[PDB]
Design a protein around this ligand. Structure first.
Ligand SMILES: O=C(O)c1ccc2cc(-c3ccc(O)c([C@]45C[C@H]6C[C@H](C[C@H](C6)C4)C5)c3)ccc2c1
Length: 238
């Protein structure tokens, strides 16, 4: 016993918020491009234009997802912004990792655009490509479903340990039921895999590491593009 209708409602609210701001790989009509498909180059300007537009669109969806999380809009507008700026890269990574097709070694974006590893390199990832693909491959054995990805994204976002929070205690209190919800959900879905909940939480460390490497890549990439990065990407990286 000790089940809670409030905790069940939180699981569904978070899963739906994620699913409604992020299509599943199976619901997308994949399409390709022949742009710099067979050889790595410093930067393909055509691919960067399409990729950075897809990144802007996903940052907007991440903000929509956040505003749907119970209690998020109850935090001060400064803390809402602080939390989004701090976790957006972590969430973009979790999201693109669910869009990895190992057989074809491709990533699929929300309009269905499917890029191979060389194309992901040429679109802007550059020296970060292989690490991102390695991260996606190591997330695959966890076999997380949409609810679990949604809950883990909400846990990364609602984090009281981010710098410059006005009400970190309030953020910590809001994160507590998200952790309870993920543990309850994960254990009930796969009771024969009790290590799944701590494996998901331990992934946050490598997710932060790959986000730090993302920020490092934005520095060098800036020197390669002809103009400034899209404004919402700049909001994320400041
Ligand atoms: O359509 C989608 O469903 C979708 C999902 C996940 C995404 C994830 C990224 C995404 C994920 C991790 C990243 O490190 C980045 C970058 C960080 C900085 C340095 C590079 C150029 C840009 C600045 C973007 C790489 C973008 C980009 C676009 C994405 C689009």
């Amino acid at each position: 016993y000790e089940l809670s209708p409030q905790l069940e409602e939180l699981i569904t609210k978070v899963s739906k918020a994620h699913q409604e701001t992020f299509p599943s790989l199976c619901q997308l009509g994949k399409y390709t491009t022949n742009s710099s498909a067979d050889h790595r180059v410093q930067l393909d300007l055509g691919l960067w234009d399409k990729f950075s537009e897809l990144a802007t669109k996903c940052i907007i969806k991440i903000v929509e997802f956040a505003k749907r999380l119970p209690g998020f809009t109850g935090l001060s507008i400064a803390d809402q912004i602080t939390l989004l700026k701090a976790a957006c890269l972590d969430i973009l990574m979790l999201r693109i990792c669910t869009r990895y097709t190992p057989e074809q070694d491709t990533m699929t974006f929300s309009d269905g655009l499917t890029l191979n590893r060389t194309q992901m390199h040429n679109a802007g990832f550059g020296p970060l490509t292989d690490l991102v693909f390695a991260f996606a491959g190591q997330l695959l054995p966890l076999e997380m479903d949409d609810t679990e990805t949604g809950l883990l994204s909400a846990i990364c976002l609602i984090c009281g340990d981010r710098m410059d929070l006005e009400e970190p205690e309030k953020v910590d209190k809001l994160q507590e039921p998200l952790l309870e919800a993920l543990r309850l959900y994960a254990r009930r879905r796969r009771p024969s895999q009790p290590y799944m909940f701590p494996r998901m939480l331990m992934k946050i460390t490598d997710l932060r590491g790959i986000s730090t490497k993302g920020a490092e890549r934005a520095i060098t990439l800036k020197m390669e593009i002809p103009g400034p990065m899209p404004p919402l990407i700049r909001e994320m990286l400041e």
